[PDB]
């Protein structure tokens, strides 16, 4: 087994994703050995997703013959499930990412959003608290909860957050449709 | 690949140990599929060791390993490891699970690290050391009657190199 393949597998499993912009060598090594990586990860019940357009190599749960394995009962899964408040925040961040991606061209750029811009839109649904401090603390708590899932990063000195492109694979149209149907069933009865 | 085999391999790699008293089904599945587990763990530079006397299935680095981290312990942990190992040896020479009282280890630790002069200090030090060893998965949870359970892994604590280092350090501490 090539050393580069093993190192790429180790790094990808440790971090959950590989980005060419930061790890071009690992990205190329894992991208050129899809069959080998699939063979190695098959006993672990894991699968690899690649987005060459956005340059990302992520790891998801391998699909078995079981109709509903729930994708959360895997022994190696450590993270908690997702509730409705975080789901709405993720949808809003996905809309922000769409807006960023529409008016974008060649060149290296990042999606940064200020908290104050996000506050009123989430106040529209959740509501408004008596003091701005309460709402700000709630928003900071939610942003920390989402950062625990690797969707965003820590705040900078100018009260801004960075939306990772991984949300694009989190809010893919299939998952969006499934969640929309589930929420519609939740509302209807 | 059988689902039971994959589950046993995943659990064994996740925990590093398998006991029939806790998971008899997984223990039987792994013990009846030695070659399959060895084939699965071969690309990972890992091997399965079986101790049928105590039903202990452990993972050993077959051959300093990318997936295994080396960390050293201090004397305040080394001497307690020696005390627990000798207690388990005495218990197994008596022929179940080795039950060691909290009050038992207070004098064995005081005669080596001195007397702190307070019962609270002794209890806190014993609890902290026991929790540190719990972080390594060497003993079980504390019982209601200030007792702990010693796992069979103490028999497979380490190679004779670490046992010789342990006895040398224990003799040095006894010298003071």
């Amino acid at each position: 087994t090539p050393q580069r393949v093993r190192e790429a597998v180790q790094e990808m499993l440790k971090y959950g994703l590989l980005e060419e912009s930061h790890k071009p060598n690992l990205y190329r090594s894992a991208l050129t050995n899809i069959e080998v990586v699939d063979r190695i990860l098959e006993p672990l019940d894991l699968a690899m997703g690649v987005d060459e357009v956005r340059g990302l190599v992520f790891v998801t749960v391998r699909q078995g013959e079981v109709a509903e394995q729930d994708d959360w009962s895997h022994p190696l899964v450590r993270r908690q499930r997702l509730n409705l408040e975080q789901s709405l925040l993720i949808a809003i961040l996905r809309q922000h990412f769409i807006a960023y991606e529409q008016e974008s061209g060649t060149g290296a750029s990042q999606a940064l959003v200020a908290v104050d811009e996000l506050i009123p839109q989430l106040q529209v649904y959740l509501g408004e608290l008596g003091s701005e401090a309460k709402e700000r603390n709630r928003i900071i708590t939610l942003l920390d909860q989402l950062k625990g899932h690797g969707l965003v990063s820590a705040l900078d000195a100018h009260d801004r957050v960075i939306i990772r492109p991984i949300i694009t694979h989190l809010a893919n149209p299939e998952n969006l449709q499934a969640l929309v149907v589930w929420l519609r069933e939740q509302v209807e009865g | 690949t059988p689902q039971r085999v994959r589950e046993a391999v995943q659990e064994m790699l996740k925990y590093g140990l398998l006991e029939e008293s806790h998971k008899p089904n997984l223990y039987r599945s792994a013990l009846t599929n030695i070659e399959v587990v060895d084939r699965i763990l071969e690309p990972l530079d890992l091997a399965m060791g079986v101790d049928e006397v105590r039903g202990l299935v452990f993972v050993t680095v077959r051959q300093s390993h990318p997936l295994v981290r080396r960390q050293r312990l201090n004397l305040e942990q080394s001497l307690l490891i020696a005390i627990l190992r000798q207690h388990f040896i005495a218990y197994e020479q008596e022929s179940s699970q080795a039950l060691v009282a909290v009050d038992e280890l207070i004098p064995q630790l005081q005669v080596y690290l001195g007397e702190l002069g307070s019962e609270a200090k002794e209890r806190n030090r014993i609890i902290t050391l026991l929790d540190q060893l719990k972080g390594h998965g060497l003993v079980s949870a504390l019982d209601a009657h200030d007792r702990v359970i010693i796992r069979p892994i103490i028999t497979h604590l380490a190679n004779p190199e670490n046992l010789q280092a342990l006895v040398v350090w224990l003799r040095e501490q006894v010298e003071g």
Binding site: L17, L76, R79, L82, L179, W182, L183 | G16
Partner: peptide, 25 residues
């Protein structure tokens, strides 16, 4: 306006799952 509804888990597969911190050794 209900905390129970807001904390009701949804259905979204985990994407970009990292390692479980440590192999517990």
């Amino acid at each position: 306006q209900r905390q129970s509804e807001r904390r009701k888990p949804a259905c979204l597969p985990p994407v970009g799952v990292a390692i479980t911190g440590v192999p517990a050794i």
